[PDB]
Design a protein around this ligand. Sequence first.
Ligand code: BF4
Ligand code: BEF
Ligand code: BEF
Ligand code: BEF
Ligand SMILES: [Mg+2]
Ligand SMILES: [Mg+2]
Lengths: 151, 143
Amino acid sequence: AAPSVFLIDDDRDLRKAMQQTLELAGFTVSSFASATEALAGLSADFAGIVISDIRMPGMDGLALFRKILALDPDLPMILVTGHGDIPMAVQAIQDGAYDFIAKPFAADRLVQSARRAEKKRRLVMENRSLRRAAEAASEGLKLAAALEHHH
Amino acid sequence: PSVFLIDDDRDLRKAMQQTLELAGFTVSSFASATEALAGLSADFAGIVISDIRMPGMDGLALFRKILALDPDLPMILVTGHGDIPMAVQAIQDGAYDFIAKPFAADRLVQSARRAEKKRRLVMENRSLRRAAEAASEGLKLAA
Ligand code: BF4
Ligand code: BEF
Ligand code: BEF
Ligand code: BEF
Ligand SMILES: [Mg+2]
Ligand SMILES: [Mg+2]
């Protein structure tokens, strides 16, 4: 499976330039004009990472970040904005954002950061998959189903 | 409540020192990062608050020296010449805080008191274990 990304920015042209950059870097990139749209495809099972702009109509990037945090704190999120400042960046990192990048930005900073974030996301997902695979026995023995009500 | 405060801006350094003293800290202030560093140790019970752009060694270089000295000695960076990538990296590298000038007094003070409490808890645990011969496991050496 190729590394994947959900990319969000209301600036359509920059969105496409960023998608083009990331696919050059090896990612499979789904893009969206808004955070709410992207959320329709996000869940704790998401194999990739989220790269999102901040200032958008409706739900802004910081609000999306909180929703991702609540959905799965192990799902990496990188914020990119032309409207941030020192204090916002510090707070976002402390809140757990994977990276906080200012526009205009070097494509290599974005790429290297996405690359590492996705590798990290993959390690988490492969371990979750192994854990589930190891549960196959109990489920097939019907042990899981019979013990179900004990949770 | 102890603090080493470093800034080449004399008026600001004096004002930060009064503000920190008002908050209850005993402050040792310096214009030079290396003079400040020379009076530090891994036994220092306080925190370090340093400016970034300065003659001689800069605050980021001083921070890297403190990390190697004792990664549990909190460093708060304050600067009027920072940007987003520099602040992000400082926090990711372990800086306790990164504050842009101009800052509100209460922002500097709250960050200092929390950092100091964090350091105080670290030193107490270190003190308590050395006091207790019985807390030691592993290799012993005997005559
Ligand atoms: F002028 Be000073 F900063 F050396 F005190
Ligand atoms: F609108 Be984004 F924050 F650049
Ligand atoms: F896979 Be264990 F038996 F829950
Ligand atoms: F000169 Be300091 F970095 F404000
Ligand atoms: Mg925008
Ligand atoms: Mg200075």
